[PDB]
């Protein structure tokens, strides 16, 4: 028996000055009927309304490391973190993240400087994000889509789709921050359409079968070369740079140091480098993360069983 | 008698989130010796401290908008903005302006998130600046090297580098705020590196001869279309966008609406847009800059007289 998706979310400003999910977001709050389908209306959320009105990714911590159920369930205070207080209210809205009261899904909205075209961030394998991708990949032939796992560290999830039951990040780059660009702003609203099309169909019992695909699973993070003091000493090499989920072979050039001389990847494997020189990622200590490039086979979600 | 230019200032980090002239700035305070030419040394200078530490375009006033003698003049507080007081503190540096004690020149580095490539803005059409950008031409052929005059409205003037008696900005894009490429950083270094060479040339006496050439000439800003209440009712149409001095005709699209609909450029003129959607120049209400394209003689500097 499946379970329909009815309390469903779309979150922009998350990050204030990733100027997409900022825009539609409130042209949605003004004209929310682009948001309804037959089954369903999803809800329009300004996730960071502060770091927005500001045009700044967060104003005192990053509102999308802010969802642990440890920050969530701390005990308030005045000097608490702007993003924490808010996302203690997102918690109110959502979730509660972890209770039956969550929402189905939220679908939160993103833009990077790196050049990673259309990319789905996905905290887990579950199957309903993997036919999602699929769904957008064959809706848009020629259009790469590609999905990235982020499976958290261990324990506790940070983000702000952590809160529903279930959710996903959409990711469109490149895109300097503050700049809203109309190619991007459209075929981001399309993508959201053809979502919301997608959860309709779930929702109506739409037989979904089994496939295989190529995703890119999360090894890891590498920083920039930097002195004894943190400071860079180096960027992204030209041969790297813009080429997101690109094959990189170790002996490849990953870095230009500023005394000219190059650094080479020292891997013992071919790896798939994504969010290559991503403005928010600097202060992470993040050049780029390491994925590796694995095909997955994904079970059918079908109305009912064989 | 041509005057040597002994006291040259190269100044980055004015805007804090322009990664070329941050680290080339803070790269030549530790490695001086690449601005030493024979007859003199150019002083570098990160010129907004504490917005280059912060990451940000200014703190409190965009400091390329608070060297006014009015601004320079005008009597200290505690309440004043900070980058009035770095103002004052560059006034003391590198003028003060108006007086005899001001340096030479002020080459002052900017990035844009726009596609200017590289592009000179000149505040006057002096026609030493006209030279060094037909000299710079004349050294990268194949590379386009733009000539921006941008005129103050009136009296006064407002930038970092009108401090000085001369001075120009060497602007590069389209690179994100808060992202450093490799390949800006190296030729925006590599034509620094020019613009010091030819000021040597002029130090030692060379001859430079008449010579016409076209320049942009500013004829001021369209804003983004907005709503009743100032928000962004659309962006930058995606057939103007990333097109930067190249001709705009009456009747060609300039923007999309949210709504789906076109707004097309009304002018009499054919106009050559640049800074097309630059981050910073949202809340400046500006969307781009009209330019005229107009054919300008230059001219000779030359060390005697005819
Ligand atoms: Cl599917
Ligand atoms: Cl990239
Ligand atoms: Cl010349
Ligand atoms: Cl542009
Ligand atoms: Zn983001
Ligand atoms: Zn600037």
Not at 24 to 38: S, V
Not at 180 to 193: E, G, I, K, T, Y
Not at 231 to 237: K, N, Q, S
Request: charge should be negative; charged fraction near 20%; hydrophobic fraction near 40%.
């Amino acid at each position: 028996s499946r379970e329909p998706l009815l309390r469903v979310a779309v979150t922009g400003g998350t990050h204030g000055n990733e100027m997409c999910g900022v825009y539609l977001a409130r042209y949605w709050l003004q004209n929310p009927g682009e948001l309804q389908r037959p089954s369903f209306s999803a809800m329009p959320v300004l996730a960071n309304p502060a770091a927005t009105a500001a045009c700044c990714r967060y104003l005192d911590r990053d509102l999308n490391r802010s969802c642990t159920l440890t920050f969530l369930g701390s005990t308030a205070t005045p000097d608490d973190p702007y993003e924490v207080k808010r996302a203690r209210e997102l918690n109110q809205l959502l979730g509660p993240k972890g209770t039956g009261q969550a929402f189905d899904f939220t679908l939160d909205l993103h833009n990077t400087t790196a050049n990673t075209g259309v990319c789905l961030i996905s905290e887990s394998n579950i199957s309903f994000n993997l036919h999602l991708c699929h769904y957008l990949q064959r809706q848009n032939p020629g259009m790469p889509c590609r999905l990235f796992l982020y499976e958290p560290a261990g324990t506790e999830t940070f983000s702000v789709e952590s809160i529903s039951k279930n959710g996903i990040c959409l990711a469109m780059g490149p895109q300097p921050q503050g700049v809203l660009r109309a190619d991007l702003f459209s075929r981001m609203r399309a993508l959201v359409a053809s979502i919301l099309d997608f959860i309709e169909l779930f929702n109506q019992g739409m037989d979904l079968p089994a496939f295989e695909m190529d995703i890119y699973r999360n090894l890891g993070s590498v920083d920039f070369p930097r002195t004894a003091d943190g400071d860079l000493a180096g960027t992204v090499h030209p041969q790297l740079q813009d080429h997101d989920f690109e094959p990189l072979r170790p002996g490849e050039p990953i870095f230009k140091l500023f005394s000219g001389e190059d650094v080479l990847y020292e891997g013992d494997s071919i790896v798939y480098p994504v969010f290559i020189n991503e403005a928010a990622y600097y202060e992470k200590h993040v050049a780029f993360l390491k994925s590796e490039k694995i095909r997955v086979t994904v079970p059918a979600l079908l109305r009912l069983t064989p």
